[PDB]
C-alpha cells in the first residue's frame, strides 16, 4: 500500500477544511474533506443517473441518456423526468469536479509543491461549465445545454455545429484547433526527445540535455529547452481549452448566423471590396 519512498511524505497537514478530521488515506488514495465531498457528489450523481436510466427504460450505457429541460422551461426547474434529473446531476458534476480540484490543492500543500495541476484542471472545469451553465444562461435556457450520454452528446455537437453551417468557420474554433494540433505535435516531440536521450543506440551511454538541445538545433535551428517545453505543453493545452470555451460562448449569443458569413467583414473592406478578379469579384 506504499511506494518504496512514500512514507516520509505522509505527514499531517495541508488540509483546507476540517483540520485533521479527514487527514488520511485509503490504500493509495488521499481523502481529505474534499475527498469526502467528491464521493458524496459523485455517488449521488451516479445514483441519479441510474435512476434517470429506469424512467427512460434501459440498463445500456450506449443508450442511457439524460436531457436538459426542454427549451420552454427557460432557466427554471422541471419535473425530474423531463429535465430536473439533469439539472441536479449537473449540480452534482460541478460539485464533484470543483471538489476534486480543491482536493488536489490539499495534496499540493501536503507535498510542498506548486498549485499548477489543479489550476490547469480548472480550465477543463470552466470549459464544461461553459457548455452546461454559462452558455445556456446567456442564451435563456437549460435546453441549449449538452445532454449526458455517450452517443447523444455527439448528436448535440453535430446539431449545434450545423446550426451555424460549417462550424469550421468559427474563427475562435480555428485558433482552438490550432492549439490542439500543436499540443499533440509538441507532446510527440517531447516524449520522443527524452526517450531518445534516455534510450540511445544499443550499447551507448545515456545522452544529456545538451544532446537534446543539439538534436533540435540541428533539426530546425532552435531548441526551446527543458524548462521551456513543459511551459509550452502547459500553455498550448490550456490555450486550446481557453479558445474552445471562447469559441462556444460567443456562439448563439454575439454571433448566431452562419459562421462562413462572418468572414465577409474582411472581403468587404473599402480599399478592395470592389476591385474585380479573384474569387469575390
Amino acid at each position: 500500500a506504499l511506494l518504496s519512498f512514500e512514507r516520509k511524505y505522509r505527514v499531517p497537514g495541508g488540509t483546507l477544511v476540517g483540520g485533521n478530521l479527514f487527514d488520511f488515506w485509503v490504500g493509495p488514495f488521499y481523502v481529505g474533506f474534499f475527498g469526502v465531498a467528491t464521493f458524496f457528489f459523485a455517488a449521488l450523481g451516479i445514483i441519479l443517473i441510474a435512476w434517470s436510466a429506469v424512467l427512460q427504460g434501459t440498463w445500456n450505457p450506449q443508450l442511457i441518456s439524460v436531457y436538459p429541460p426542454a427549451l420552454e422551461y427557460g432557466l427554471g426547474g422541471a419535473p425530474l423526468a423531463k429535465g430536473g434529473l439533469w439539472q441536479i446531476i449537473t449540480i452534482c458534476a460541478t460539485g464533484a469536479f470543483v471538489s476534486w480540484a480543491l482536493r488536489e490543492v490539499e495534496i499540493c500543500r501536503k507535498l510542498g509543491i506548486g498549485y499548477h495541476i489543479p489550476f490547469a484542471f480548472a480550465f477543463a472545469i470552466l470549459a464544461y461549465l461553459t457548455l452546461v451553465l454559462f452558455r445556456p444562461v446567456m442564451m435563456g435556457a437549460w435546453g441549449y445545454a449538452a445532454p449526458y450520454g455517450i452517443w447523444t452528446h455527439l448528436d448535440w455537437v453535430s446539431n449545434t455545429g450545423y446550426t451555424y453551417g460549417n462550424f469550421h468557420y468559427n474563427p475562435a474554433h480555428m485558433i482552438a484547433i490550432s492549439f490542439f494540433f500543436t499540443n499533440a505535435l509538441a507532446l510527440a516531440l517531447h516524449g520522443a526527445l527524452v526517450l531518445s536521450a534516455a534510450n540511445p543506440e544499443k550499447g551507448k551511454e545515456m545522452r544529456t540535455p545538451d544532446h537534446e538541445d543539439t538534436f533540435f538545433r540541428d533539426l530546425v535551428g532552435y531548441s526551446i529547452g527543458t524548462l521551456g517545453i513543459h511551459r509550452l505543453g502547459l500553455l498550448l493545452s490550456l490555450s486550446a481549452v481557453f479558445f474552445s470555451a471562447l469559441c462556444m460562448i460567443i456562439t448563439g449569443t454575439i454571433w448566431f448566423d452562419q459562421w462562413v458569413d462572418w468572414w465577409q467583414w474582411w472581403v468587404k473592406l473599402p480599399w478592395w471590396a470592389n476591385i474585380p478578379g479573384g474569387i469575390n469579384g
Binding site: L3, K8, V11, G112
Partner: protein
Amino acid sequence: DLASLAIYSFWIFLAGLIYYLQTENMREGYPLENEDGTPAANQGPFPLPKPKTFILPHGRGTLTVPGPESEDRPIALARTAVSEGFPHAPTGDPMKDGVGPASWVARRDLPELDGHGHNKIKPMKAAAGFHVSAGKNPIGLPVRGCDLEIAGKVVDIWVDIPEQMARFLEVELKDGSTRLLPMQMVKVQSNRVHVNALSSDLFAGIPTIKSPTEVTLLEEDKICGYVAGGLMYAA
C-alpha cells in the same frame, strides 16, 4: 468485414500497450510496501518488468531498474494510529530531519555534469562569459523572509551552463556564510528579493554545501527540500 477486424484488433493492441506502459512505470517505487517497510501482500495485477540498464556517461556507472530499493537514510517519523493509512508525525523538527514537505532523497553526492563532463551548475562569478542578459539583476539586493525581516543579501546567481538559466540565488547571512535558495522560490522585486517559504530565522538552517563553486545532487535535494518545507513548517 475489414473495418471490424481492424477495430477489434485495435482494442487488443491498446490493452497490450496499457499493460506494457503500466509495467514500464513500475521501474521505481516497487514492490509496494507496508508502512513498516516490508513487502505488502497485495502488489496489484501488473508484474514488475524485466530490469533494464542505463549506462551513465563520464564513468559515473550504470543503473538497473527495477532493483532492490532503499531510502539510504533514517526517517524521523512515527505512527499516529493503530492501523494502516493515517499520517505519520515527525518525531523531531521536520525541517532539520527532512520529512514531510521538507523531504530530500539520497541522490548521488556528486554534482550533475554537462555533456562535456563539466559541472552543470556554477556560480556566475566562476562562469566564463555569463552575465545577466535581461530582467532585474538580483545581485546585491537584500533578501526578505516571510516574517518581513531581512535575512541576508544576494551575492551571486548560480547558473546552469548548458541550459543558460538561473538555478539558485546565493545569499549571504549576518554571520558571513552563504546559502543557496532555489530560483523558483524567490520573487525578485525592484528593491528586494522576497522569500515567502522561510522566515528570517530559518535561513541559517538551510543545508550548506561543502564546496563554494559546485553543488552535488544530494545537496540540491536538501536545499530544495528544506526551502519547500517552509511553506508548511514556518508559520
